[PDB]
Amino acid sequence: MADLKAAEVEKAREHFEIYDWEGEGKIDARDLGDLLRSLDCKPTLAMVKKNGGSDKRGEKKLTLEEFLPIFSQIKKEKEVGTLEDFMEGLKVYDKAENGTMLAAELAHVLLSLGERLTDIECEEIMRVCDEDDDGFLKYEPFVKTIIAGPFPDEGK
Amino acid sequence: RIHFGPMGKLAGADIETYLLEKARVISQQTLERSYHIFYQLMSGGIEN
Numbered sequence: 001m002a003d004l005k006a007a008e009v010e011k012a013r014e015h016f017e018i019y020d021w022e023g024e025g026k027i028d029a030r031d032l033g034d035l036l037r038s039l040d041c042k043p044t045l046a047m048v049k050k051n052g053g054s055d056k057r058g059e060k061k062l063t064l065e066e067f068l069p070i071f072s073q074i075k076k077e078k079e080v081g082t083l084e085d086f087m088e089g090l091k092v093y094d095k096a097e098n099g100t101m102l103a104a105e106l107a108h109v110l111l112s113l114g115e116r117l118t119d120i121e122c123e124e125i126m127r128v129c130d131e132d133d134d135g136f137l138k139y140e141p142f143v144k145t146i147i148a149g150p151f152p153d154e155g156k
Numbered sequence: 157r158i159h160f161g162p163m164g165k166l167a168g169a170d171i172e173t174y175l176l177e178k179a180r181v182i183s184q185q186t187l188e189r190s191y192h193i194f195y196q197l198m199s200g201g202i203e204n
Contacts, residue, residue, distance in 0.1 A: 085179065134196060137195075 003093055004072060012071055015039055026061040029054040030069070041074050042081075045115060083147060090139045101133040101142075128156075 004012065015038055019027050027035060032053040036043060038127075051070045052060065062070070093101060107122045117125070126144075129137065145152065157170040184190060 105165070 002072065002075065004068070011039060012068065013064075016067060026063060026098070027067060028057060029060045029062065030057045032062065032067075035067075036071065036074060039071065041071075041077070043077075046075070047077075083143060086143050087139070090143065093139075097141045100136045101139060103137065106137055 015035060016025075019031060019035055029052060032051070033045065033048045036048070039093065045055075049055075052062070053075060054060070063104075090101075091099070093105070103126070107126070110117045110122055110125065111119070159167040159169055160199060161167040180188070189195070
């Protein structure tokens with residue numbers, strides 16, 4: 001079987017107690033999304049709603065007694081992703097064996113199919129880049145910074 | 157000539173002009189009107 005360890009119970013308690021904005025001890029079904037995400041399990045919104053979650057706000061409230069039989073189900077998933085799938089994937093763009101990627105062509109793929117990102121998030125994803133014209137990013141430093149997160153060594 | 161920027165959005169427009177009917181201003185032929193700007197200035201314009 002599987003059940004939650006003293007350390008894990010503390011991780012789950014901390015985050016839940018933060019999410020109590022009301023003063024009653026409860027989470028929204030929408031907020032189930034980013035709560036698990038901060039808990040470090042990476043899901044689709046499909047994974048969130050699968051365990052009783054909402055698009056809308058103001059639908060159902062879940063206690064910690066409800067939330068823990070959500071989290072202890074969630075832990076079973078195996079297909080999270082690696083680096084190398086993404087390399088293989090993002091290599092497909094090529095035409096001449098350069099590993100280089102033009103800015104428009106790269107915003108568009110982020111926008112269009114999937115759970116999707118907005119116009120706004122693309123303006124943010126561009127923000128770190130500076131001073132390269134007509135107008136090329138590169139597949140390898142890109143992916144590695146995504147997996148490294150917001151503060152690798154530098155961080156702004 | 158409609159102009160677009162580096163990322164996505166609009167940048168400007170270059171428009172040339174071929175001919176104009178300047179000939180008509182003397183007397184138009186049948187049931188035509190002369191340049192729209194005129195009629196507008198005649199009716200909309202205040203006493204001042």
